[PDB]
């Protein structure tokens, strides 16, 4: 066995929280490390964003 | 008598067979999942040396009508789509194989040149 392939892949996603912009508007919001905001999605369901 | 010719003459008629399938091998080089095919000339040839059925053969107007072991090539370097045909080593097994045709047709020209150069 001399040949290997070489696929690639997205492990996921990068769980890293990005930089705050003070927008100084009422509600916009801006969540902690490791929390999501639930939204109900297209089809109906629990996604969630940041 | 006069089957003295028989061996040489049997052992090319079994090298061009093994040309169509080493052929086979080299236009299916690309397809997947081929399993190249091969025979062994030694064991062929001394069993056909020492070797379809009849049918209804009465007087004409009934239609008389006709009726090798093809060995796995142990393959190298497995190809993820089935086909075990390494091009380099059918390559260099038909230029032998094509040199040793031409070996046997020199030989037959040879006996019978001979039978001829006897009978004049």
Redesign the interface.
Known sequence: ???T?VTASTPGADMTPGQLDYTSRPLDVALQQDGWLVVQAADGAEGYTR | LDAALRFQQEALNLRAQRQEILAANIANADTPGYQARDIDFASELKKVMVRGVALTLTSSHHIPAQAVDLLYRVPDQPSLDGNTVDMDRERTQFADNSLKYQMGLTVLGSQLKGMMNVLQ
């Open positions: 066995a001399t040949r392939l």
